[PDB]
Design a protein around this ligand. Sequence first.
Ligand SMILES: CCCCCCCCCCCCCCCCCC(=O)OC[C@H](COP(=O)(O)OCCN)OC(=O)CCCCCCCCCCCCCCCCC
Lengths: 96, 71, 172, 318, 80, 112, 344, 96, 111, 69
Amino acid sequence: PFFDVQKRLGVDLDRWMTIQSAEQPHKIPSRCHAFEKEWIECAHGIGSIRAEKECKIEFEDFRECLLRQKTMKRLHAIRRQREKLIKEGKYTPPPH
Amino acid sequence: LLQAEKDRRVLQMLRENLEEEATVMKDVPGWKVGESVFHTTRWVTPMMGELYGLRASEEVLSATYGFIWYT
Amino acid sequence: MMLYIVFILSVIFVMGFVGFSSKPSPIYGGLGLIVSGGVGCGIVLNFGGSFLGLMVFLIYLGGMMVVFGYTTAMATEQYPEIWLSNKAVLGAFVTGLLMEFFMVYYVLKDKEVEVVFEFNGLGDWVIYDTGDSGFFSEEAMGIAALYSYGTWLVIVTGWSLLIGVVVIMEIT
Amino acid sequence: MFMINILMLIIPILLAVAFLTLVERKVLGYMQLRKGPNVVGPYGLLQPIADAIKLFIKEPLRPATSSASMFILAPIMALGLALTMWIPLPMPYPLINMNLGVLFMLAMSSLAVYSILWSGWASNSKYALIGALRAVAQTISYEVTLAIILLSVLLMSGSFTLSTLITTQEQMWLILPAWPLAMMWFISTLAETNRAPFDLTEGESELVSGFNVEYAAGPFALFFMAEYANIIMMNIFTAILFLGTSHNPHMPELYTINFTIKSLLLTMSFLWIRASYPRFRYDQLMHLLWKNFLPLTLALCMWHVSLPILTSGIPPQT
Amino acid sequence: VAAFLKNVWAKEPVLVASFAIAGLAVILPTLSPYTKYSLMINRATPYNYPVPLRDDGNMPDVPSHPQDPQGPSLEWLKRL
Amino acid sequence: MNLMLALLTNFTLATLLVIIAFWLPQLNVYSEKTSPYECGFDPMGSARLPFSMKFFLVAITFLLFDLEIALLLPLPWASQTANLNTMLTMALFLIILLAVSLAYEWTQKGLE
Amino acid sequence: NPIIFIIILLTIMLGTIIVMISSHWLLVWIGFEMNMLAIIPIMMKNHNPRATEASTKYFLTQSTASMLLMMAVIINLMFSGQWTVMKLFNPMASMLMTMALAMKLGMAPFHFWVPEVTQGIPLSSGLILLTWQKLAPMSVLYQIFPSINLNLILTLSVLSILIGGWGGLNQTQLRKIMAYSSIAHMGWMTAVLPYNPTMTLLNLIIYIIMTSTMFTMFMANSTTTTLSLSHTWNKTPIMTVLILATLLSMGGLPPLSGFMPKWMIIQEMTKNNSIILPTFMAITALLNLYFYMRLTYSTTLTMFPSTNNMKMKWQFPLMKKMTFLPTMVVLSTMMLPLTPMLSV
Amino acid sequence: SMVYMNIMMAFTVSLVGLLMYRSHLMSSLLCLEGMMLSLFVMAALTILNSHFTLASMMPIILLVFAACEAALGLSLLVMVSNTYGTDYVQNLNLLQ
Amino acid sequence: VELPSLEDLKVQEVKVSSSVLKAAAHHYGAQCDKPNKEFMLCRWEEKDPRRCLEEGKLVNQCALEFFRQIKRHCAEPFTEYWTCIDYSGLQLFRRCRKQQAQFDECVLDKL
Amino acid sequence: WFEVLPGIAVMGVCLFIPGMATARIHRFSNGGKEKRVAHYPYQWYLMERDRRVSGVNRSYVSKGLENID
Ligand SMILES: CCCCCCCCCCCCCCCCCC(=O)OC[C@H](COP(=O)(O)OCCN)OC(=O)CCCCCCCCCCCCCCCCC
């Protein structure tokens, strides 16, 4: 059972390493940092059981900032708009 | 000063990697010109694959791995 | 020295294992590790993390394994052997080796086949960096030294080791 | 031509490790009251061309009882990690610039003893079997004496790289301030690399001949050229980590000139000992490390930690 | 008890030199006032980039021109 | 890109030089009798290597003192901080947690 | 020696207090990683050729049990990259959590172990400490509680309370008979767990007491069933009314307190209109009773007092807190509709 | 991208027949003490390619036990083959 | 997405090495501060360095006339000053300390 | 006592090559200027810039003040 003593009295055991945006000693960010303060802002006063069916938008792109899962596919699909037609015209680019 | 040189180097860099994309093909089952892979709208620093395309010859290899393994 | 010099290490690494993940007469078990550990500390030295790579040599591969090898003279096997010579060991090997190979063959041998192996593109190291940056010791694990914020993380590890010896002063 | 800067290193050094073997018995000659190899030279300086050629003509037997797969990969090392370790070592300009490289030695100082355990085991029974086992055991207990007393000073200089370690020893020959430690930096490399007063690994007295016993002329030049590729390096190190020279952005050359007239004095120390002292009887050998060498090395670490902090001294690095 | 402390120094004068340095490095950091200088220097080294705040009304101090009178005295070190 | 050029250069002189020494006269036409006369001056030697303990512990005994002097390693980077007292008060703990771990075992090393 | 045995035996609960107190996936690794580090010497004390072929069959069976977990921690470090302790954000995490965590508790499979250790630890003293390791894991499952595939944690349950039931009917050694039917009571508390997860703890405390008061009773000399026959005509008959005032209450009959977990649990598992699940559990703990009957026909039937055996001496063990428990292991039913609203 | 499917196929090093068996236990215990580096490296990338900057110590703490503990369980493997001289997983004696 | 055209580009970048660029570099910023601190606030205060290009041509501009200033009055002591610091490795500032006055003789004085 | 003075002069010089070789390759390859060093990713960032503006492709050719007039 989760007692949460560090809430009652004053100490911090961990609570700092926890999330992707807290301090980072010299104030240097992460890559997807800016989407945390967006997504936590969403579900806080929530009780998290409606969160899943409420927010879900600010979460998904955040999952797609992290892994770049889609942008890598729409990218890999330029290799099929060009580089099947190389011989068929528009070498693209002119170098330089 | 040093930075105000870079930000111009990438915005120049996206345009050529777009304007020289949108003129490759305009396909009916293609993509709109410069859509967004996200819903949200603001400026998010681009991934290496954005700046350099499938170009992938050398000056890339001296960019990503440039700093590491040596002066 | 192409852009694939990372992908060529791991698939040696993945093949570093299957040597000792079957049954090689474990004086060659080590030689399945110090290659794997070596190439392992190889991969990590890209990406910019360095200090944290060069330690695995010092604390584990260099220091630990020798104990793993300083015994197997105490447990000493009877009359060792060159592995893969036998029919017991050799049979189990290849089907592993091909299983990534036949995977690696048509994983992408073409445009895409099919979906689950098709969402991984290759060749520019698309993600492998971002933009430029400033410098702190490097940027990343250059600052791995926290005797600031981390404390209750150390003092367990600091205390959990101190008991490591007491347990082992006995059963010995 | 970066490939011709390398091969200009590996080759010109194999002459030192060759012509050390001559100055081996001249210097150790006149301690005895006599002259050194003389008849063949005329001065003797021509001896080592004749010795390199007797071995590889002389037939290289293998024991019928050996495992040949290990009897190669092991010596095919005793000549790598000896010739790789030289790479990032400033004189003044190192061939590589490694950011944290000082740590990289311990990486290659730690990975050689795993070429002893192979060879002595690779072959056969109890003169190289349990005789190559218990020279493992002493070789790893003289690291903890080491990495600490290497780590001490590095509080007193700021970082892990070697380009800073010329800057800080400017006008202060880093041997004043920690002279208690420096001693232990010496008895270590002499205990770890299997040299005179703690001699046991290579046998003379305690056994017949340690670890060399099997190799005939064929492979045994490598070890006898490997074991002397460590000894002139740790001692070509100590003097970048203690007795510093003064870089000169103008006449780089006068840096090395005054640099080999130090590291080459320093070395002539493991020869100036070997005439002198006897051996330790392997009990006393480790039994004097935990009890005796170690407690200090911790204690000083509690000292060089505070001394910067307690003087507002803290050296300018990350 | 001082006869003890002289009758371990006729037998093992080794670790005694470690204890003698074991303490005497723990004790002193709470004594000499040179310390706490050490914490002031080490706080003032600008690893990062100072970002100018917004001034509407106060603006307690620190004008646009930096060399004008602005803020604390760090030059007690330059003379030091 | 020039490190691996400075490594595989080094081995390839070494992995060469084995064959030009070991192998070259190894196929020479001299006698080289197969007689079981080899394995010098302990002629036969038929046994297992027995377990001998005080050989063993000096393995374990090290491995643990080893770890924390990886934990102890990032002092000289951590000497540059904001609040430093959490260092000196904390840094000096590991050491004494190391040195304690001696004093106990120090009642019995045996013959080490 | 005697000091440290209280340093070790203290560090255990310090191993499991960092488990219940923490926010942070790393610590719930370190937390029950240092039990498998700090348990092992207790097994040893008399240095015999079982404990050492026991704790080594224990060791590597709690070694991977942990070391999978660290693989199912670092999955959702990829996805969402937020540690802490909450639903696992990805199905390959949980399914690699709960069915690789069932190794420490062992559930329906993953027990060829609990009888191989509990049997033949030469140390029967305790071996009461294998009631901690029931209490470390649950203090995860209560937190992760709203993520499970839900078709599993029942499928390890219902294949458990069955398989631990039949396990013992064939057993004689009575360290095993407690080993078995301690998989059983892991069938009730993790079968509930998605529905209203308190009224689990209720079954968790009532369990820690009852199995506790057994061992403290099994400590005088008692070992094998047919050494509990030589009991009543030798040691003391006031002992026998005890061992019959519990072993019956532990499978449970309504005037006792052993009936207290079921009676409440089914208030919960129906009202959710699953009435075809609980009968089969309710009805299977039945032939979980036929150990205890036929255990209890050993001691009240005056079976061949051992031999001429004359123990004229009195006792000097530590009964500590045994003179309480079977007034709280029995008589508490009349007391409490607290347990659902007390711990909650 | 691809480096996350290697190394993963590597972390099926578990393979359990070769995790407890067959004899020469030291082979089993071996593939355990190298089950790390599949846990380590895999977690030395995801931490690294995105700058967490904080959890970066975690990789260090994944060894410091992985060596400490796995070096314990070596100890028993002396007690087994002290009384025997061959480990040989084929010792079953305590039965059920 | 909206990106500006190819235009307001190809502007005049200061093209100099990285040795000279650190030669003065010092008198440079302390005395200017007209766009630049302000130009930070067009980034830190509001991100997306796309909406803010304008001062980028102001801050780039300040440099232009700066190096165009210095070429008129004294380039001779400067040209010799950034030679030593360009004699190389690390680009230390403690080797050229002697010549630091010769460059700064009349710069702090004349102009 | 003297006869050892020649014995040194072999080993000594043979270590005075490898220090003068690398020193005079770098000074020769980059034409009079010691080799740049990039320890920290900022430091690199100027070279890979300076390669672009120098004359063609290299980091060792500095433009100077008259470049921009
Ligand atoms: C307030 C500030 C702090 C104040 C502190 C005051 C001073 C304390 C500092 C003193 C510490 C000095 C170094 C540590 C002590 C020396 C090590 C030692 O303790 O040796 C003890 C050793 C044990 O011998 P023993 O106990 O008598 O048992 C044998 C009985 N048959 O007895 C011995 O004699 C062993 C001798 C050494 C063994 C090896 C010697 C071999 C020869 C090598 C000598 C060369 C080293 C010279 C240094 C060169 C430096 C460039």
